[PDB]
Amino acid sequence: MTYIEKRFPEDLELNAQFLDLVNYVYRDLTAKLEPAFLSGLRCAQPLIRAKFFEVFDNSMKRRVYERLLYVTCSQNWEAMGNHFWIKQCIELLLAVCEKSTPIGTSCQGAMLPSITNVINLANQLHMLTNRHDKFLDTLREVKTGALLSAFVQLCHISTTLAEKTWVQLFPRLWKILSDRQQHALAGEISPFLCSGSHQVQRDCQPSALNCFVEAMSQCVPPIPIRPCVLKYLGKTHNLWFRSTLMLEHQAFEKGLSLQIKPKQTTEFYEQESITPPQQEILDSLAELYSLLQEEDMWAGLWQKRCKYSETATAIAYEQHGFFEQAQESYEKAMDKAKKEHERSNASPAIFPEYQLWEDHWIRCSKELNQWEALTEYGQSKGHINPYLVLECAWRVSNWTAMKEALVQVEVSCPKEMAWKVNMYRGYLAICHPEEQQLSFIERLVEMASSLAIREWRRLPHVVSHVHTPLLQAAQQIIELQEAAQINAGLQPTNLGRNNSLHDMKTVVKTWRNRLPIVSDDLSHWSSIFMWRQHHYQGKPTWSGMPSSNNAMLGVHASASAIIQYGKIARKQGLVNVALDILSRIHTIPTVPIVDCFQKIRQQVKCYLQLNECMQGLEVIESTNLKYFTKEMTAEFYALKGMFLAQINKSEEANKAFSAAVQMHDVLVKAWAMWGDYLENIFVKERQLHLGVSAITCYLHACRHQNESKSRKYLAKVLWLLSFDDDKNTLADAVDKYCIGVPPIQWLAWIPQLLTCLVGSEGKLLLNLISQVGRVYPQAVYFPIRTLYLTLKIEQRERATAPMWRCSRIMHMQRELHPTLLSSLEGIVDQMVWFRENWHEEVLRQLQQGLAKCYSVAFEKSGAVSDAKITPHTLNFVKKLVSTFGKLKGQFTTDFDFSVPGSMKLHNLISKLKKWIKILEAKTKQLPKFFLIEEKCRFLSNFSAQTAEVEIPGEFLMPKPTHYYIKIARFMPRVEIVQKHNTAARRLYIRGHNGKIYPYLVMNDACLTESRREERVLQLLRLLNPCLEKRKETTKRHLFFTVPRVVAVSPQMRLVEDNPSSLSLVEIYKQRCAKKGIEHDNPISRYYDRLATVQARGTQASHQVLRDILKEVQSNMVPRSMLKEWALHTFPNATDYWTFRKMFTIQLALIGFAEFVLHLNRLNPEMLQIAQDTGKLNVAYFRFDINDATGDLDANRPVPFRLTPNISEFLTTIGVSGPLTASMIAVARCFAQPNFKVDGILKTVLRDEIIAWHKKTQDSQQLVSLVQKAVTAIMTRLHNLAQFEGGESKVNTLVAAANSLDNLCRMDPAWHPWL
Amino acid sequence: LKPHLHKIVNSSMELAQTAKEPYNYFLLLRALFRSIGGGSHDLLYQEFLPLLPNLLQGLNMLQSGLHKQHMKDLFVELCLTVPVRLSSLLPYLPMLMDPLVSALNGSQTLVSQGLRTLELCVDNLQPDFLYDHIQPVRAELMQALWRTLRNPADSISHVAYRVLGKFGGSNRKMLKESQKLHYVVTEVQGPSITVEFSDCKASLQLPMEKAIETALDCLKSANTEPYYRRQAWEVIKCFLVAMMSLEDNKHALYQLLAHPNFTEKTIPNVIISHRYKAQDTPARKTFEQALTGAFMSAVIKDLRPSALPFVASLIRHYTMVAVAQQCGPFLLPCYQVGSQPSTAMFHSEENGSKGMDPLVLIDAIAICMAYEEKELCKIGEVALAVIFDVASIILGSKERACQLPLFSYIVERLCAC
Amino acid sequence: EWLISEDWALLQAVKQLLELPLNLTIVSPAHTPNWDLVSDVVNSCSRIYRSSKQCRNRYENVIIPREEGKSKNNRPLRTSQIYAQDENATHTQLYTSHFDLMKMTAGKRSPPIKHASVLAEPIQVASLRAERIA
């Protein structure tokens, strides 16, 4: 029975007869062939399966509870292997259902009505009647047994159908049982899950246990589950995220919070026990987070349960680097704990908090390059840890400890870590203590790779940090094999052979480029570089006797490895360890002079980046006794100049720059620092003839460098421009020396270029815009269209030199590229057809008016209920009837508005509300679908043949890459959609690459307002690149995700979009329409109850504000709407978790941007969340500046939006983990003095404030005001980037944001409750 | 072979754009690519060189369409394996990325070929330069790579892992796009069938949205066992008989079908259009899927003997109810003398169309017509003929049958294809 | 080297998770014992993990004799009494020794630690910009 199948499974008949015999025997202990019987129940041939099931179904009772018991206690499923027994489970359970009943459903709403039904709602024909009767009868007698018998077959053939049917069926079955027996079953489910009989299913991706746990999660009385078994299930059956969600739900409902431990455990009497329950659920969950590499969530958990204070500080330090500080903080924590334990009990509660310090001290120590210390500790005199020695001893010169330290590790067999030991065997196999033949390493590497892939197959479906170790290992595995090949090339037969000499050069060149990224901890980088250094050291030994450069090749490889390792060490901030690593180079007797130059350069950079000025002098002046190479003489001259600049030295630094430029002129950084010094001089005591030096220097710097590392100097140029006087000598220097600077750079500064051109004497500047447009037509056209039409609109509503220049450019570049310009104009002119019908025309203005008047109502909140409409709002109301004032609406609106717009504010608001309601309701009947072919022509005919045009917005950011995508065809359909303040139409483009790209054509008034939003978007776009230069920011994948918008025309513009994107207010609208009220009730209650309290001669008071917030949140705005929506819209756990984490990550950046840059407040509708990816983008922030003055201040109650209905979805751990870490990391990143974040603000804000100055009335006044305004940004940044005893101010303001005492007194329009 | 190589290439490319069987041109193109390559050439490559900028761009455009599966596989295969040495292909490197990405999502042969090419270029392309040219599609290329490691064919996964390792840190460098998540947009569930027990006399309701989707997939599939085809059709038939009412007698049907106002009274000119349809609600989506499956069952042999006599009567009943709703003494208000193409016509969550509207039948017909296998057109036309026949029979004249609103939807929906 | 902590941890794990008699008498077929689960739970607090093989080995070779009470170990008190008594010694001593050792390690080694043309003078500042072109 068990021999016939395992080595002869390819048969289909012999197995058939054998299973027939097995089936027969069970009809007549000899009933011990259960493995074969169960294999029979999973046979492919349907008839065999039915025959087996026939008897299997009579070995039970005709009841549901009995069969649910049988699948849980009276049956062993270990018999079948990678099968999915839930299919047989479904069969057995459904087998008890009736079969003789005529079919029926409860879905009366989806039923198809009968023909005679229409009566109830109130002779060929005869032959047809009878022909219908005789079909109706035969369709009348069908009985459900048919459907039930067939459903299970489809379940058999398809696994996904089976699993989803099980998930949807088990909860329903649960309700059938009475509680008297539900509890009995639930008691024994937990035994079922832990049983080892399910071990075989460990590697099955759709494991039959995974489906079972998923299915039970929905049982309406939550089935209990031990908090420890869940960790193991997540580990094995790939239930990671579902397990974590279950544990979180238990933690935040069972303990109601973290074991926050406000005081010492000797007085923290509320501990649940010496090994507290509701604390194992915390530790298992913490371990799950640690496994998932979710270090931020883990830290957010440990900073909320820790007993000692020191551990929290160490976690904060380590989580952001500063490893040297984290190590000492841990050491002091251990010391303080020891001095208590020496006269105190163990308190088993703090076991994990104890081992945590050891683990993280190891982690910090290794990443500081304390390898020898770690090895010695690992081989402690007692309590030895072998794995640490195995990991560390080979990086150090030792080659004996690891040889020993493998034997006990192998017997330990840490599965899920098995690839590492197999890989490590190869290290000895190559760098054997004595020697090895290294021929078998191929099997080692292939086994390691296979096992790594096997492990990968059990991690979640969507890649995250959890997958980082494997992607990180791949490189070192292949480098092990690569070094094995080279060593094989070093055998005496092959050693010194030209063929090998070629292979070694190829491999060294390959290695010198394949590197990790800056987001990989210094431990991993150490692994790679020491592994390489071992073999680099090998070659000089054999070539150590012919003028053999092979030894020189090895020397170069080793020196480069050392220098690069030290360089990256410096890049991460560990200057001291970088200093030691670089100083190690002295041990080599012979080194190329260029390597010495690089060494001194790195050391002097280290000195600069921490001061040690006299060491920086000595390390330079001690060199070039007779002759170093000629070129870097400039390099050390420039370095000395910048040292002298760091210190108060002035003219010798000038001599230093003059010397540095003396020979080759191509040293970019020398120009950069000379310009910085000259600008520092020129900021005061102008002596403007000196000023040209800075512009010359920056332009020279940008001449050679290109496409990046240049934008800062262009910002410096455009800032210094504003100092030019009437005798515009700075313009003269620009013209005389901006020659040859490539146009590609300027694309990033188009709007600033234009706004400066519109100014006085812009004619001299017009040369550069002409140059750029000549090369990049599409880039400068649309901005010029919009600006020229803006001037035409303004000068007409109120032929001019600005318009003259704009035309002088447009009709000049018309000479070139006439086809392209003609095509663009054709598109734009056609696009006018997208205008909306009267309904939307009215509703846009009504929405604007409602927002405008609610703003005032808040401004008059706590004051007269009879507040009066302002002259501005009344002017808007008058314009409404003027432009619109179909019979009923035309009649009603003209008497409900215009001059009648006066009188009581709160009655006009109600009338506006009901008018909005009625018009929006009428809009339902509109078609939701219309084509390009009708009512517009030229777009449909568009194709790549006409002219090549880039996807609108591709030029928003210059890139040396070609990267450009052309339009291929406009799709034949366009969709009408709702939106926050409009119903703009959507159209689908198809690029030349075949992808679709939906777009929104939005039309708006108040052009001057709209042109600030793209300014802030430009700033965000220009800032994103700096987020890629730092480890702390890269680790968490931080980016601003600015969408793409292009100014087609002043009245309307294009913006990128994706379906499925919706704003919070939309979710609120959905869940409100799910009930018998409308969305405006919260503000209604707020204002009406405030008014009633006011009517008793009582002024607004903090307490009643808090009361109204609490009550409105209690009854009509429960906090769970956001989480409940996320739950029902992501019923798959992994998607839920990733969506939530991406949501939090993006919201962190949103809040930081809102605060540091003094932006407008974030209303609910203003925030858009992408359901498909969870990314966040805002509805066009804008700098908040006072009408009265351009002081640029934003002092609202809450620094940024953290509504409770968001916090509960993020849960307490998230709001204290990722958010705070991300904000602090960003603030640290921008604070870098290396990045000239000055100019990128001192230009954008200089542009911005002109928009204010124009709306209300152009000299050094502007310079001084922008200089002031930028210092507000600088202060609000520095004062949350510094690290101190209070590790960051962020702690204060994140707590402020969610505090009730700062939300309840927020504008009700701002929806602090949602 | 040196002369008129340009002809066999360019003329074949041009001609393939228009023919009832373009397959063969690409077949012989594949043959030419294989033969001319593999070192059987010195001057043939030199002759081939100028063809690259046009041929490669043409193939890149071609593979981006929505062609049948085998055609797409052939396109991606052709785009790779172009007879050119590793070097000197650099200028045109960017325009084979998308085909390369498409390969990794195809069948095992395509995946293996794609990985082979990717490694081949990686080994010798100076990673900085290669990354520069890979940047445009990295976001999707890396997702495809990471997905391949789950491939059961270990011979694929091992190569994929070696490739991922061959990249430096770039194998994980931040992607500018997150992975697409699945989500449910409907806050309501699908239909359900009653199943009851003697246990506490309770009854149970279970869904079959996914069940019928899987049945439809099985019928669509080209290699399902015929037994499973029969089972799927049984499921579909039972569902369709469940989702209709079988109430009325002979007289109740006769005394209404024979009523005046079915032949004498005028027919209001009520336009109907799918441009006013809200959304494919689950109750309508599953119903349309079930009807399309039923059509796929009538066409397919060994089910035709029982499917057709059933599907024909289903049409004969759907048309009868549809007309009775929009004609005769008791029409619904949504077909009243004055009415527009309202959303009331179609089943919607808030406006239940008095149950399920018969118009879904037309959407099923439209879908089966537009399906890849044109064979379904032969049953679609039969359905249309039966509909017209029944309408004419009850209305007394074909011209009257043509005025009935249903046909206004029919024309628009079918033309929408 | 294994301590009372691991012994009691795995004993209680087997007793209360698998819901199985200490003699591993399988009352009902579906609930077979699982030793990887026990290995995980015990490793959750052990200083160094040990394979489920070693966990079951320790069970069979120590706990089964230890628990029975009729063993010739002077009528042992079973692991429960020992675990109750030794709250302090092992927990405190192991970690304190580790902390002291790594403090000594921190102290160890050490508490961590002309030309082609030159000298134009500065008239060159502006003139040189253009003069150097040729």
From Swiss-Prot, chain A:
Adapter protein, which is found in various multiprotein chromatin complexes with histone acetyltransferase activity (HAT), which gives a specific tag for epigenetic transcription activation. Component of the NuA4 histone acetyltransferase complex which is responsible for acetylation of nucleosomal histones H4 and H2A. Plays a central role in MYC transcription activation, and also participates in cell transformation by MYC. Required for p53/TP53-, E2F1- and E2F4-mediated transcription activation. The PI3K/PI4K domain is required for the recruitment of HAT complexes, and the MYC-dependent transactivation. Although it is strongly related to the PI3/PI4-kinase family, it lacks the typical motifs that constitute the catalytic site of PI3/PI4-kinase proteins, and lacks such activity. It is linked to Developmental delay with or without dysmorphic facies and autism: An autosomal dominant neurodevelopmental disorder apparent from infancy or early childhood. Some patients present with intellectual disability and renal, cardiac, genitourinary systems, as well as structural brain abnormalities. In some cases, the phenotype is less severe, has no systemic involvement and is characterized by autism spectrum disorder and/or intellectual disability, sometimes associated with epilepsy. Affected individuals manifest variable dysmorphic features. Signal peptide: none annotated. It is found in: Nucleus. Changing residue 227 to L: In a lung large cell carcinoma sample; somatic mutation. Interacts with MYC, E2F1 and E2F4 transcription factors. Interacts directly with p53/TP53. Interacts with GCN5L2. Component of various HAT complexes. Component of the PCAF complex, at least composed of TADA2L/ADA2, SUPT3H, TADA3L/ADA3, TAF5L/PAF65-beta, TAF6L/PAF65-alpha, TAF10/TAFII30, TAF12/TAFII20, TAF9/TAFII31 and TRRAP. Component of the TFTC-HAT complex, at least composed of TAF5L, TAF6L, TADA3L, SUPT3H/SPT3, TAF2/TAFII150, TAF4/TAFII135, TAF5/TAFII100, GCN5L2/GCN5, TAF10 and TRRAP. It comes from the Eukaryota. The modification N6-acetyllysine is found at residue 599. Residues 229-790 form the FAT domain. Residues 977-983 are annotated as: G-loop. Changing residue 1228 to Q: In DEDDFA; uncertain significance. Residues 971-1278 form the PI3K/PI4K catalytic domain. The gene is TRRAP. Residues 1178-1203 are annotated as: Activation loop. Residues 1282-1314 form the FATC domain. Residues 1158-1166 are annotated as: Catalytic loop. Belongs to the PI3/PI4-kinase family. TRA1 subfamily. This is Transformation/transcription domain-associated protein.
Curated annotation (Swiss-Prot), chain C:
It is found in: Nucleus. Residues 1-63 form the Myb-like domain. It comes from the Eukaryota. Ubiquitously expressed. Belongs to the SNF2/RAD54 helicase family. SWR1 subfamily. Component of the NuA4 histone acetyltransferase complex which contains the catalytic subunit KAT5/TIP60 and the subunits EP400, TRRAP/PAF400, BRD8/SMAP, EPC1, DMAP1/DNMAP1, RUVBL1/TIP49, RUVBL2, ING3, actin, ACTL6A/BAF53A, MORF4L1/MRG15, MORF4L2/MRGX, MRGBP, YEATS4/GAS41, VPS72/YL1 and MEAF6. May also participate in the formation of NuA4 related complexes which lack the KAT5/TIP60 catalytic subunit, but which include the SWI/SNF related protein SRCAP. The NuA4 complex interacts with MYC and the adenovirus E1A protein. EP400 interacts with TRRAP, RUVBL1 and RUVBL2. Component of the NuA4 histone acetyltransferase complex which is involved in transcriptional activation of select genes principally by acetylation of nucleosomal histones H4 and H2A. This modification may both alter nucleosome - DNA interactions and promote interaction of the modified histones with other proteins which positively regulate transcription. May be required for transcriptional activation of E2F1 and MYC target genes during cellular proliferation. This is E1A-binding protein p400. The gene is EP400.
